[PDB]
Amino acid sequence: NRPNMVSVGTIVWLSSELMFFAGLFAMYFTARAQAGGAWPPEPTELNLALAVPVTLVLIASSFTCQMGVFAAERGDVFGLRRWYVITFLMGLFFVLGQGYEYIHLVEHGTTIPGSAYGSVFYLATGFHGLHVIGGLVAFVLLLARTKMSKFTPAQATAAIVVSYYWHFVDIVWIALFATIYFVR
Amino acid sequence: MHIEARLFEILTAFFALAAVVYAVLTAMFATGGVEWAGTTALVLTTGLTLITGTFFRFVARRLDTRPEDYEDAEISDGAGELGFFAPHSWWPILISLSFSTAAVGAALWLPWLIAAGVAFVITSVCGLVFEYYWGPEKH
Amino acid sequence: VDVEDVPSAEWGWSHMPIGVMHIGGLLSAAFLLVMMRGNHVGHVEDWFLIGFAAVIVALVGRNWWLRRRGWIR
Amino acid sequence: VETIFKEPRWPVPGTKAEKRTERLVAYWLMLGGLSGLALLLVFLFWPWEYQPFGSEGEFLYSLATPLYGLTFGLSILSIGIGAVLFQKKFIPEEISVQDRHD
Amino acid sequence: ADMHRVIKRKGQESFNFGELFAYTKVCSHLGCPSSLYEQQTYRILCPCHQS
Amino acid sequence: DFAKLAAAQGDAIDSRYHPSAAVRRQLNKVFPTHWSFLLGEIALYSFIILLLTGVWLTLFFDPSMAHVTYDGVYQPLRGVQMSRAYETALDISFEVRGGLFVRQVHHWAALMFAASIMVHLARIFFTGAFRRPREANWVIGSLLLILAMFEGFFGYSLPDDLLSGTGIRAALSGITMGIPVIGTWMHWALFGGDFPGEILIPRLYALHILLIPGIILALIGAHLALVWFQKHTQFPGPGRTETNVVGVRVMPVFAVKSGAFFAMITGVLGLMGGLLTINPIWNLGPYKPSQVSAGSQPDFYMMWTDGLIRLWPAWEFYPFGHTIPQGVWVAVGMGLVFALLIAYPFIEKKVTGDDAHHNLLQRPRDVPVRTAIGSMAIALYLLLTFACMNDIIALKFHISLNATTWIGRIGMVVLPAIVYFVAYRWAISLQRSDREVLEHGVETGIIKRLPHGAYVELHQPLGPVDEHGHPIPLEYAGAPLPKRMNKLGSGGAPGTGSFLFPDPAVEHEALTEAAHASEHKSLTALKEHQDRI
Amino acid sequence: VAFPRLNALSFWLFLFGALIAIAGFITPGGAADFGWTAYSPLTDAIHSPGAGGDLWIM
Amino acid sequence: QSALLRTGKQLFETSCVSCHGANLQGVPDRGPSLIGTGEAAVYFQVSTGRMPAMRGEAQAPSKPPHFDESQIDALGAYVQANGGGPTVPRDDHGAVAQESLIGGDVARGGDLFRLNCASCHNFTGKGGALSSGKYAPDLGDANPAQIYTAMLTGPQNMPKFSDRQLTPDEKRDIVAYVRESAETPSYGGYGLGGFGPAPEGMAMWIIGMVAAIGVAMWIGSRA
Amino acid sequence: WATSCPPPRHNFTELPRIRSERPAFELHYPHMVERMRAEAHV
């Protein structure tokens, strides 16, 4: 009969977090306008054979995260744990996939000090990867709390607000993925 | 809670108008074309009010009038338990100390101090989250 | 000490004489003042010693005066 | 000495939790055995001789001592973890009072 | 250019060969080698106890 | 088969030694289970590991000062003149399989041993375990801490490298020779002439491998025997009195826990020995009096002595054609600290006047003056230790080296005063926090709005209540009081099953009923015992 | 307030964050000297190499 | 080459007159004279990024360079033409020598470094603090040419070791030890910074004691 | 201004009827309630 206080606090903070990514987006666009015709410039060669499967995994993690919310709203703690463990594994795969992309980009001459494109690319995607890592920590902390006490409505609220952050992270990546790999 | 999001929708419309006007006015008769830094900030400033306003719009249409949303409600209408509010906790000062340790390490570029700070933050945040959920000791 | 000031007054050592803290503070300031004797050629440190010694002396004097007048016990 | 409290950890027999806890203790002991065998194998076959700077074997040599501590440390630590778990999950909980007569 | 700032010790006014000076490397405090010679400030720093 | 052999051997042992009454007494002895009681075992386990690794090291170490030419595999030191002590120390870490691991484990074990004593000493001081009839047990331990300090100091001086050789030259030589009247005669008797001489390392080797460890082992045996027959002090609580010991018997609970703790302590030291580089002597080179590197810090247990040297001003006296150097201040101050540490229980019993038998510990919050004094001493020790690292701190943290010396100098007098005042207020404030629970109950954190608009917080009484509903105020009993509802069991249990799949409902109900039945009986047994006595 | 513990966290984050920036005055180089506006490239490591500016940022 | 000289002066005018003067005589209380410092001093001071300096303090720190290799050579030639002085070693192709400066006797370089450098830079070039706000920076980033020029020119508080006090072969041996002691991995695990007991005691207290006390909590009981 | 100085731990031992932006003024001056509604508009 009353709005969820934790949900309102999380959504309010999630809106503010978007302005942090606004600054990173401004840096990428400012450097893109000064590229001069090459964006990305040589020797940076983005490959979609790896980014696309990595992006699809993160998108699929949102669906399983939503499934855990349905279990949490249903009062099924075991269903919530199964879906959030699966979500954590795919979220971890996203971090490993991004890092594996980072290793090959560095070997081919795309680094933060190497070029202006490397600076904006790594800051924008790296800070998002830090947000993904923070989301994985939230999953572990929330799941550890599931083994401490009985499944209460306040505990179910904590599961919902964590999924809000995960959905926010996934949506931001879609903007980053479309802006970097398609709007060149 | 119909007033709360009406505040954000009003801000959303103005931010959307300013973002569109600034982008168009910088595209024409402005050196360098579209000024990307301000346009990006204005566009995503509209996003901030849009997400909060849309959420408040969905919450408002679900639940009926609250006692604080009534134009003639009585004090006795709000009787009952409000919720959980933490009485005391020394974890927040530990979280800030943990975060300040990482910032000092990042300021002076000491990777060992950064690693210690990150580990301290995780432990401090874990204590705050688990403070009111730890069970009794089992022996 | 009374249980109103220290609730666990009967469970352990809970009282330290005020004379010990007052004399210790005066000796605290005196040791700071004698440390200006040395091989250092700068005087930035000397002013820091003087300031800390003055603060300690002022605190000791304020506490002693307030206890003498009876405003604090 | 008077034992005022003494109860078994699993009064209800035939429970899945008891079998699950039994495997948890065995898993830590199995890890200790695997790490102890690994310590035996790395000490005998890992390249341990010093290699000069800029040589091909320098990197493998630099991991010789680190591998000794990782395998030795994890082995006995896992055994200790399993022993603690066995006491806290299978050894009956007891409270005993002894007169000091001091 | 810094030779005018040199102050001589009694009984040691002629111990230097022009602008060359020789001082013991052993610190007078506890015997550590005080060899942190700063050329501009002309300060000899002992790494053991900061003399 | 296996049962008959045990019975046959048991009868054979009993027929020849009749150790039945005595062994049963050792199996039935009760030890309290508090976590802080295990702090003395960490130091004991570290010493055992030191003995095991130390014996291994003696099979390869040549403690000679004779100068030789290096012929080992370490290329950056090929041909460099060095002593045999530095020669074999490189041989252990390079020419013997596992020698580097053993040498690192030994030195990490020393660091844990020194750190364990300081932490274990803190509990003894703050909880009042030093009081009678345990004054002599405190005194024996204080000697053990001093012996450990010098044993560790001699330990890393054996390799005769540049870093430790510099530490020997200052601490062992200059301070000793600066002592008035007999100071130079002590230097000649210990070095066999002038520094460095030719007999220092062999003599230090003997002192470090036989004499000091032999004295430590004898004192440890007396420590364990005293803390094995005088019994162990326990914290106040339900059923705990001045004449009983509450806990678990040795067999099998305490033996398993102690043995498992030994395995875990060894693993931590084994991992650190093989995951963190400690004392890389090959990077420092052999000791030469003409060489000197920056950051000449000793081991952390010997830093406060070095910090005292760095901080004390250059105050010297020259009476009648003689010299009293600055090292005399440190030498006298070092002795004063040891004298105060050893004789503290008698000082307190003289000041407080309390000379009664004590078997129940005191919570540190309940003794604000001693807690403030101990916090003051800890702050002084920490500042002295960090003053030894002032040059290292100055480089890494961008602080003037002159500033760090004066910060430590002024802080040496100001910071202990601040810490004493803060700790004294903090200790009393925790007493007030404990009281608030007693007359009002545990704050559940749930806010309720009354029909007339009052905001009240629901409280959980710890005892009987009034007819109005307010709990009867309870009297403090020296025991910790709950402050979180989740610690009282209000959170319940998640549900019996694996992390991903639930167990059948009947099994969960049976398990939770058995658990609730077991906890109630345990509480009832303690309550019935407390009521009887 | 809605989040009593988050409210307390803000105070300490604010107190320790302010102390970090002010702590530049104890460094030999000093604190930040590029103005509170911190205009670029004056704040670049080339033009502001000191640790006082870094403490100001963090 | 007249092209290299006028390029160096043209770079000098808008970057180095405010503190060093238009004729390289130095500006009192702002900067010393650059006459006789040589090309080696300019190469070190600019390639290490130490110059142009930004303010007066205890010690000018290193930072990203303000000029590239071609501009450094032009600046060095302009200063070299005014008073002469030492020059940076060069290879056959005329580039700044880096690999050819690595000496073949690292054992000799180690003893020389411990006699002449360890006091200010530490056993393994990790850096060390000086009197008042000054310090000997860590040596793990300098290339062999930078180390050679630092030994030649003696920057700020470091002694100006001449080619007679330390012969070119001795200098090459020292930089060989400096370069190898920075690129050699630790043998007993993580290096902990290489500063000695001070990180070692910190690591023990924060890792082993925390684990030991944390394990004691798990095995033991409260109250 | 409708609570004690200082307010209790939970800020309120009671709450008045809220009908405008001056609840404390209405609580302390009930006779002025009619006047404020009548004179609110110029």
Ligand SMILES: CCCCCCCCCCCCCCCC(=O)OC[C@H]1O[C@H](O[C@@H]2[C@H](O)[C@@H](O)[C@H](O)[C@@H](O[C@H]3O[C@H](CO)[C@@H](O)[C@H](O)[C@@H]3O)[C@@H]2OP(=O)(O)OC[C@@H](COC(=O)CCCCCCCC[C@H](C)CCCCCCCC)OC(=O)CCCCCCCCCCCCCCC)[C@@H](O)[C@@H](O)[C@@H]1O
């Ligand atoms: C149960 C408990 C028991 C367990 C306890 C065990 C814990 C230990 C764990 C770690 C073990 C690792 C083993 C591998 C060892 C190894 O193979 O080693 C590689 C090399 O690595 C470093 O080379 C760097 C470069 O590669 C070189 O290229 C470069 O040259 C070099 O630079 C030096 O040399 C230059 C000149 O050459 C100088 O110019 C320069 O300045 C410097 O000196 C670099 O070194 P450096 O910067 O030192 O650090 C760089 C470090 C970054 O730091 C760090 O690790 C910090 C973190 C650890 C350090 C120790 C802790 C610090 C504590 C402090 C007290 C904090 C302060 C707090 C204050 C509060 C209190 C105060 C009051 O990055 C990394 O490795 C990244 C790796 C991170 C891995 C994390 C581990 C994951 C654990 C997860 C466990 C899960 C378990 C779950 C179970 C269920 C040097 O070491 C080399 O020698 C070494 O060879």
Ligand SMILES: CC(C)=CCC/C(C)=C/CC/C(C)=C/CC/C(C)=C/CC/C(C)=C/CC/C(C)=C/CC/C(C)=C/CC/C(C)=C\CC/C(C)=C/CC1=C(C)C(=O)c2ccccc2C1=O
């Ligand atoms: C290169 C290379 C590899 C070389 C390295 C060399 C090296 C470092 C070797 C170390 C090897 C080590 C240390 C191995 C042994 C590890 C170990 C402890 C074994 C594992 C045990 C284990 C996993 C347990 C499972 C089952 C089991 C056997 C249970 C425990 C059995 C027993 C009898 C325990 C042994 C532990 C022990 C020594 C003590 C228990 C007995 C008693 C009564 C302790 C004595 C005692 C204690 C401990 C007190 O707490 C105490 C407190 C107050 C007053 C007095 C006392 C007192 O006298």
Ligand SMILES: CC(C)=CCC/C(C)=C/CC/C(C)=C/CC/C(C)=C/CC/C(C)=C\CC/C(C)=C/CC/C(C)=C/CC/C(C)=C/CC/C(C)=C/CC1=C(C)C(=O)c2ccccc2C1=O
């Ligand atoms: C005489 C004497 C005692 C000197 C000390 C004087 C002094 C001013 C000390 C500290 C000064 C500092 C920390 C300067 C930085 C500027 C700054 C932010 C100031 C503090 C501001 C303030 C008080 C408010 C913020 C809140 C707050 C309290 C946070 C600060 C927390 C931090 C980061 C403190 C750490 C300071 C400190 C002394 C710790 C050093 C510990 C040691 C011994 C480190 C040795 C060490 C080193 C050096 C390694 O290289 C290494 C490499 C790899 C692994 C490990 C290590 C390692 O541990």
Ligand code: HEC
């Ligand atoms: C103390 C008096 C020193 C002695 C002896 C040596 N060095 Fe040094 N060095 C010292 C300082 C204060 C500085 C910084 C000066 C600057 O102008 O900023 C240096 C610098 C170096 C460098 C440059 C390092 C860089 O930042 O990459 C190198 C390579 C260097 N020093 C090496 C070096 C060698 C090989 C020495 C023995 C001959 C030596 N230094 C002695 C302080 C002192």
Ligand code: HEM
């Ligand atoms: C070699 C170092 C030491 C070892 C191995 C050691 C070992 C132990 C052990 C195992 C115990 C029993 C467990 C415990 O209460 O923690 C104990 C108790 C005790 N130790 Fe230590 N100890 C050492 C040093 C010290 C020091 C430095 C002091 C005090 C200065 C001290 C004084 C005591 C006292 C008074 C007890 C009484 C036990 C009690 O009443 O709880 N010991 N010691």
Ligand code: HEM
């Ligand atoms: C309290 C007990 C002890 C402490 C604190 C201690 C401490 C130390 C330390 C810190 C070192 C230097 C380690 C290193 O070189 O890296 C050392 C060296 C040594 N210790 Fe011990 N030690 C102890 C007991 C013993 C015992 C009992 C022996 C022999 C039985 C022993 C034999 C040695 C040997 C041979 C060395 C030198 C060989 C080497 O440098 O590696 N120690 N000791």
Ligand SMILES: CCCCCCCCCCCCCC(=O)O[C@H](COC(=O)CCCCCCCCCCC)COP(=O)(O)O
């Ligand atoms: C290296 C091995 C050294 C010897 C270790 C011996 C270990 C096996 C002990 C077997 C005990 C037999 C118990 C029994 O029920 O048989 C009993 C043997 O008779 C005894 O009472 C023996 C008393 C002396 C036992 C002292 C042993 C101390 C060992 C401590 C171990 C922690 C048979 O009695 P019963 O008929 O069952 O009543």
Ligand code: FES
């Ligand atoms: S040894 Fe030179 S200062 Fe003490």
